[PDB]
Enzyme design. Sequence first.
Site, PDB file in Angstrom:
ATOM      1  N   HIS A 423      36.145  42.753  44.169  1.00 50.22           N
ATOM      2  CA  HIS A 423      37.081  42.456  43.089  1.00 50.22           C
ATOM      3  C   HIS A 423      37.603  40.892  43.103  1.00 50.22           C
ATOM      4  CE1 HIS A 423      40.774  43.083  40.511  1.00 50.22           C
ATOM      5  NE2 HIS A 423      40.944  42.136  41.393  1.00 50.22           N
ATOM      6  N   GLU A 424      38.050  40.533  44.328  1.00 51.48           N
ATOM      7  CA  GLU A 424      38.334  39.158  44.318  1.00 51.48           C
ATOM      8  C   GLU A 424      37.138  38.181  44.199  1.00 51.48           C
ATOM      9  OE1 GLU A 424      41.750  41.008  45.371  1.00 51.48           O
ATOM     10  OE2 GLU A 424      41.569  38.946  44.925  1.00 51.48           O
ATOM     11  N   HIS A 427      36.996  37.391  40.721  1.00 47.86           N
ATOM     12  CA  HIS A 427      37.786  36.433  40.003  1.00 47.86           C
ATOM     13  C   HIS A 427      37.187  34.950  40.240  1.00 47.86           C
ATOM     14  CE1 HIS A 427      41.467  38.759  38.926  1.00 47.86           C
ATOM     15  NE2 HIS A 427      41.537  39.219  40.256  1.00 47.86           N
ATOM     16  N   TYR A 465      44.258  50.039  36.171  1.00 46.75           N
ATOM     17  CA  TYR A 465      44.573  48.587  36.453  1.00 46.75           C
ATOM     18  C   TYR A 465      43.897  47.551  35.683  1.00 46.75           C
ATOM     19  CZ  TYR A 465      45.806  44.104  38.759  1.00 46.75           C
ATOM     20  OH  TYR A 465      46.323  43.013  39.301  1.00 46.75           O
ATOM     21  N   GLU A 472      42.092  40.710  34.887  1.00 46.78           N
ATOM     22  CA  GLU A 472      42.076  41.890  35.687  1.00 46.78           C
ATOM     23  C   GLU A 472      40.879  42.879  35.177  1.00 46.78           C
ATOM     24  OE1 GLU A 472      43.386  41.441  38.510  1.00 46.78           O
ATOM     25  OE2 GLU A 472      44.452  40.019  37.927  1.00 46.78           O
TER      26      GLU A 472
HETATM   27  C1  LIG Z   1      42.897  47.960  42.588  1.00 48.14           C
HETATM   28  C2  LIG Z   1      42.992  46.899  43.233  1.00 48.14           C
HETATM   29  C3  LIG Z   1      44.078  46.408  43.718  1.00 48.14           C
HETATM   30  C4  LIG Z   1      44.082  45.212  44.296  1.00 48.14           C
HETATM   31  S1  LIG Z   1      45.506  44.656  44.880  1.00 48.14           S
HETATM   32  O1  LIG Z   1      46.232  45.626  45.395  1.00 48.14           O
HETATM   33  O2  LIG Z   1      45.438  43.708  46.063  1.00 48.14           O
HETATM   34  N1  LIG Z   1      45.962  43.848  43.670  1.00 48.14           N
HETATM   35  C5  LIG Z   1      46.609  44.311  42.340  1.00 48.14           C
HETATM   36  C6  LIG Z   1      47.208  45.715  42.224  1.00 48.14           C
HETATM   37  C7  LIG Z   1      46.757  46.871  41.597  1.00 48.14           C
HETATM   38  C8  LIG Z   1      47.425  47.916  41.397  1.00 48.14           C
HETATM   39  C9  LIG Z   1      48.690  48.154  42.143  1.00 48.14           C
HETATM   40  C10 LIG Z   1      49.346  49.323  41.955  1.00 48.14           C
HETATM   41  N2  LIG Z   1      48.599  50.322  41.189  1.00 48.14           N
HETATM   42  C11 LIG Z   1      49.214  46.860  42.881  1.00 48.14           C
HETATM   43  C12 LIG Z   1      48.759  45.804  43.161  1.00 48.14           C
HETATM   44  C13 LIG Z   1      46.095  42.150  43.589  1.00 48.14           C
HETATM   45  C14 LIG Z   1      47.412  41.717  43.005  1.00 48.14           C
HETATM   46  C15 LIG Z   1      44.948  41.698  42.662  1.00 48.14           C
HETATM   47  O3  LIG Z   1      44.807  41.829  41.219  1.00 48.14           O
HETATM   48  N3  LIG Z   1      44.024  40.887  43.511  1.00 48.14           N
HETATM   49  O4  LIG Z   1      42.999  40.176  42.603  1.00 48.14           O
HETATM   50  C16 LIG Z   1      42.907  44.502  44.688  1.00 48.14           C
HETATM   51  C17 LIG Z   1      41.666  44.981  44.412  1.00 48.14           C
HETATM   52  C18 LIG Z   1      41.768  46.434  43.341  1.00 48.14           C
HETATM   53  F1  LIG Z   1      40.522  47.006  42.953  1.00 48.14           F
HETATM   54 ZN   LIG Z   2      42.770  40.670  40.749  1.00 51.16          ZN
END
Ligand SMILES: Cc1cc(S(=O)(=O)N(Cc2ccc(CN)cc2)[C@H](C)C(=O)NO)ccc1F
Ligand SMILES: [Zn+2]
EC number: 3.4.24.83
Length: 515
Positions: A423-424, A427, A465, A472
Amino acid sequence: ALSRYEKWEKIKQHYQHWSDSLSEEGRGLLKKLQIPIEPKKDDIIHSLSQEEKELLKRIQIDSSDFLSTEEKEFLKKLQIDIRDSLSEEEKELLNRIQVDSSNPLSEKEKEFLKKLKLDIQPYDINQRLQDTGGLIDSPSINLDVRKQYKRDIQNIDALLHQSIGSTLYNKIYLYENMNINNLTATLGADLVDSTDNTKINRGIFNEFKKNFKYSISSNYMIVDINERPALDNERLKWRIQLSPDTRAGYLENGKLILQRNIGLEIKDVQIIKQSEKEYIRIDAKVVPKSKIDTKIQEAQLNINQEWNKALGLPKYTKLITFNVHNRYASNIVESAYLILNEWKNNIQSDLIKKVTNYLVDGNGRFVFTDITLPNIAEQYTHQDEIYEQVHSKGLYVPESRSILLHGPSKGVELRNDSEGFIHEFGHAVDDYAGYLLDKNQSDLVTNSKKFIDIFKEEGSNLTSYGRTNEAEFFAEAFRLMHSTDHAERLKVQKNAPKTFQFINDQIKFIINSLV
Ligand SMILES: Cc1cc(S(=O)(=O)N(Cc2ccc(CN)cc2)[C@H](C)C(=O)NO)ccc1F
Ligand SMILES: [Zn+2]
């Protein structure tokens, strides 16, 4: 049986001069380390405006995507104080709107919480040491507090001058009970078997044992002279052997505080039984920190040489960074090999190569760490404002062209660390696409005319999300499109056809960039 109370007495005598020599400033310091100082809920609430109270009352805190776990927990106890002044229907109603309430926060909500977090920090020396991995100059809290931390840590180091000695160190064991979630929130939830909680999931266990070979303590470990029966959540039972010159201090009720910055070599990891529950024994031996750092650096050199080759990069490109300082050190290091493997297995070799070249052109890094992301320079050198800094599992920072992955925490909606990485990388693909589109005005391709419209229509079809914003939405769609599970790839094609189309387009556009 070798007597718990005589062991205790002999260690107390070894430190008796030291104890009796403590000034009472010295004593205050040690108690403050043991018992952190929490924020005053009353004063916080007293300082809110009536409009801010109304907002804090109605807000859903786990919808945040930037607060640490510690910060999230405090705020919820703060919501409660706010609420205990109401009807029973108000309280029940406000809790009624919570079920189908996985949704993104309003903008005025988020902005509020981002500023509120500056005011809810406890003063907690051991937590500050673990969060920064010993690098306490990291600009992630207020400067004045930061300097108070420094004086206290310096004074504690100076109090802990007496080593355990040549006589005691191979006659005694020290013990530490631990929650599994403090090493790995991922393996934590699934290492206790579901069928039966008194049992350890043997598969996860072999995984955990697999490269748990060393451990670093960046704060001051409090250990028990004698083993204490486990509490509810305590399924890890460390048995530690110190080295002759390990410096330590006696604490009341049979404890030792050890010096910060030591290394631990894992000698053995077993499942054992204690009153019909299963626990994990971990046998460990104190070694010098530098020894383990040497092992970390060699691993960093080796993973870069391996990946420099496989990517067609200059031999000495510094691309992968191990920023490792905490108790699950060796797993962070080994977990990065596996993450990068799943990444090459699930993404076209040309896409991976062309984007990573772009990151390297901006001095970028893949940072694998067990300290919190606000304390990584790839984030904080470009985010001066604490209220803008993010705690999370993963982050992409365009200003530094870096991906940050925090090992110890568990991402919501994530099956594993590999998914988070991809996912990163999503970005970063978004970044490069926007740059190719317009090389002087380098913007994100999700900020384009087209993609905004697509998001305005399909933005709700994929993950919860994904509804947050264009960036996102893109990142999630990209993650799902490269899932190992086949069904996941197709749900995107069917529930969000234009996005599927748009991403595959950018991938073409990137691979079709050249010389
Ligand atoms: C689902 C998901 C989460 C993360 S994450 O937890 O690292 N993350 C965002 C985040 C999402 C949801 C919640 C609580 N629902 C808290 C935080 C960070 C800011 C992010 O957008 N890094 O690009 C990374 C990859 C993923 F697929
Ligand atoms: Zn992200």
